[PDB]
Amino acid sequence: QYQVGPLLGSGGFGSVYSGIRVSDNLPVAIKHVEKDRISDWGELTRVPMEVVLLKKVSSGFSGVIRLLDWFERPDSFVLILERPEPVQDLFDFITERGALQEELARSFFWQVLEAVRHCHNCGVLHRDIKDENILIDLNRGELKLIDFGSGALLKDTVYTDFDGTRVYSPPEWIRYHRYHGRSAAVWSLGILLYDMVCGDIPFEHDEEIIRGQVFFRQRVSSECQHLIRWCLALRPSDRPTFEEIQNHPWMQDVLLPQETAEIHLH
Numbered sequence: 001q002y003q004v005g006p007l008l009g010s011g012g013f014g015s016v017y018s019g020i021r022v023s024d025n026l027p028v029a030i031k032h033v034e035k036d037r038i039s040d041w042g043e044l045t046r047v048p049m050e051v052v053l054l055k056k057v058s059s060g061f062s063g064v065i066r067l068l069d070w071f072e073r074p075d076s077f078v079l080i081l082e083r084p085e086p087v088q089d090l091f092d093f094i095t096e097r098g099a100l101q102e103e104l105a106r107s108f109f110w111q112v113l114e115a116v117r118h119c120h121n122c123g124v125l126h127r128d129i130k131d132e133n134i135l136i137d138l139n140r141g142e143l144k145l146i147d148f149g150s151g152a153l154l155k156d157t158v159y160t161d162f163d164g165t166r167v168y169s170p171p172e173w174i175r176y177h178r179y180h181g182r183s184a185a186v187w188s189l190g191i192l193l194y195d196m197v198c199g200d201i202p203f204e205h206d207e208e209i210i211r212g213q214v215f216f217r218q219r220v221s222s223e224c225q226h227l228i229r230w231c232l233a234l235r236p237s238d239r240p241t242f243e244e245i246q247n248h249p250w251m252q253d254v255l256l257p258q259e260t261a262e263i264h265l266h
């Protein structure tokens with residue numbers, strides 16, 4: 001069914017390879033996850049939650065990665081995922097190009113917000129929003145959310161489990177090992193937006209996160225700084241909602257994805 005290509009990445013959430021669907025030469029990604037590292041299971045048969053979550057967000061909307069198929073092996077699960085070509089993740093993009101212009105960051109952040117709003121609307125919490133988990137369709141200027149391997153079903157009660165990225169985690173998790181989905185998601189969005197406009201994350205140590213003092217190492221507008229400091233409110237209830245973020249003055253007059261490519265990506 002699939003012609004396997006080179007390894008696109010390896011880590012805690014498995015190994016991911018480049019692939020070709022022999023049927024129509026469709027570009028795909030082949031993700032392998034060891035069953036022994038899957039703590040969360042669900043159904044709709046017994047599959048990892050990642051498969052469950054991915055099928056809930058599966059749609060015609062292109063802000064979230066698409067699950068094409070999956071397979072069960074004796075000791076692993078194999079995910080066949082959408083693969084844009086060419087593509088580059090936000091981490092490598094910022095790593096090679098540095099801090100993004102606010103016009104480009106606005107377009108990107110907007111697309112991320114629309115994707116996470118989609119997940120939440122579908123009952124899914126991603127729980128690992130970051131530059132590494134965002135793909136860029138370089139031709140269409142469209143962003144895609146990837147890696148749902150640390151995500152859970154969205155709920156209104158407290159989460160006592162977390163296995164996402166620590167430097168993107170909120171101060172309520174660091175201290176109390178407790179967080180609520182939406183507020184915690186907004187925090188990671190604040191970390192992400194800072195990362196976009198400054199070229200790196202604001203906090204590296206637990207002590208910095210608890211304190212939540214944001215220092216700008218780059219020239220950033222007052223409105224962007226405001227939105228960032230707002231998302232990074234210590235008290236979760238002082239954090240904006242997704243509506244309040246997208247009605248923020250800095251989020252005004254966003255570029256269409258195709259405009260974003262012709263100006264910034266070509």
Ligand SMILES: O=C1N/C(=N/c2ccccc2Cl)S/C1=C\c1ccc(O)c([N+](=O)[O-])c1
Pocket residue numbers: 008009010011013014015016028029031032065081082083084087135146147148
């Ligand atoms: O849903 C997903 N979870 C992922 N996790 C990983 C992320 C980094 C390294 C290894 C793994 Cl398994 S990758 C992934 C989807 C992708 C789909 C297409 C694609 O080109 C890529 N990519 O380039 O890494 C990734």
